[PDB]
Amino acid sequence: ESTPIQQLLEHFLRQLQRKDPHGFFAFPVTDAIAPGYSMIIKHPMDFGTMKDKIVANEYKSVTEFKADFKLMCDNAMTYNRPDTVYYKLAKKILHAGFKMMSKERLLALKRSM
Ligand SMILES: CC(=O)c1cc(-c2cc(C(=O)NC3CC3)ccc2C)c2ncccn12
């Protein structure tokens, strides 16, 4: 049993995860691999958490999903230095997400529904 919003959100999530083939954004960051992480990042987010929220139907809208996506990227851009693979990849993901879930993109989608 799934719903149209769940299917749409699963599509966006799958498209974004394709940009992170190594799964750096797939699971929560621990302090053991990222020293100090929990002291600097107060609201952690990752793709796996987002997938669980989709499954539990916790997102009422694409706006709420976008907010978690944005948090995940902002966290990575705040914690990691600009030279790192994690920072760079966060910028890539974020740009892809802005393109995919922009207001004009969502308008065109609404037109077709
Ligand atoms: C998003 C973020 O800030 C982040 C993600 C990771 C991460 C890395 C690996 C890994 O396999 N790394 C080896 C290739 C070098 C696995 C799982 C995670 C969560 C990470 N590690 C250190 C500092 C920041 N991060």
From Swiss-Prot:
Segments forming domain Bromo: 1-102
Compartments (UniProt record): Nucleus
Region described as Histone H4K5ac H4K8ac and histone H4K5bu H4K8bu binding: spans on this chain: 78-80
Site (Histone H4K5ac H4K8ac and histone H4K5bu H4K8bu binding): I33, Y86
Subunit structure of this chain's protein: Binds acetylated histones H3 and H4. Binds butyrylated histone H4. Component of the multiprotein chromatin-remodeling subcomplex SWI/SNF called GBAF, which includes at least BICRA or BICRAL (mutually exclusive), BRD9, SS18, the core BAF subunits, SMARCA2/BRM, SMARCA4/BRG1/BAF190A, ACTL6A/BAF53, SMARCC1/BAF155, and SMARCD1/BAF60A. Interacts (via N-terminal bromodomain) with acetylated RAD54. Interacts (via C-terminus) with RAD51.
Function: Plays a role in chromatin remodeling and regulation of transcription. Acts as a chromatin reader that recognizes and binds acylated histones: binds histones that are acetylated and/or butyrylated. Component of SWI/SNF chromatin remodeling subcomplex GBAF that carries out key enzymatic activities, changing chromatin structure by altering DNA-histone contacts within a nucleosome in an ATP-dependent manner. Also orchestrates the RAD51-RAD54 complex formation and thereby plays a role in homologous recombination (HR).
Domain characteristics, as noted in the entry: The Bromo domain mediates interaction with histones that have acetylated lysine residues at specific positions. Also recognizes and binds histones that are butyrylated.
Protein name per its UniProtKB record: Bromodomain-containing protein 9
Name of the encoding gene: BRD9
Coverage span on the entire protein: 137 to 238 of 597
